[PDB]
Amino acid sequence: ASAEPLIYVLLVLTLALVFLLYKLMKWLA
Amino acid sequence: ASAEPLIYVLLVLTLALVFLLYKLMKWLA
């Protein structure tokens, strides 16, 4: 057991937020 | 009611993930 898998987890959760930002930008444009 | 407050929400949730990345980097260094 290590913290190494959290590299993946934090990558994909941050990508989720970025994707939400993209959609919010479109909805506000 | 609008989507505008989600600008703040997405900003601070993404910042939370960035802060986690900082700590993970330190713990793995």
Show residues of chain B in contact with A10, CB under 8 Å.
17, 20-21, 24
Closest CA to A13 of B1, B18, B29: B18
- Find the helix packing angle between B6-28 and A6-28, rounded to 10°: 160
Show residues of chain B in contact with A6, CB under 8 Å.
20, 24
Experimental method used, please? X-ray
Domain count across chain A: 1
The DSSP letter of residue A5 is T
Residue A23's domain comprises: 1-29
Which strand (E) or helix (H) includes residue B13?
helix B6-28
The neighbour count for residue B29, using CB atoms within 10 Å, is 5
- Per the structure block, which two tokens stand in for B26? 């330190």
Judge: B14–A18 Cβ closer than 8 Å, yes or no: yes
Closest CA to A18 of B4, B5, B10: B10
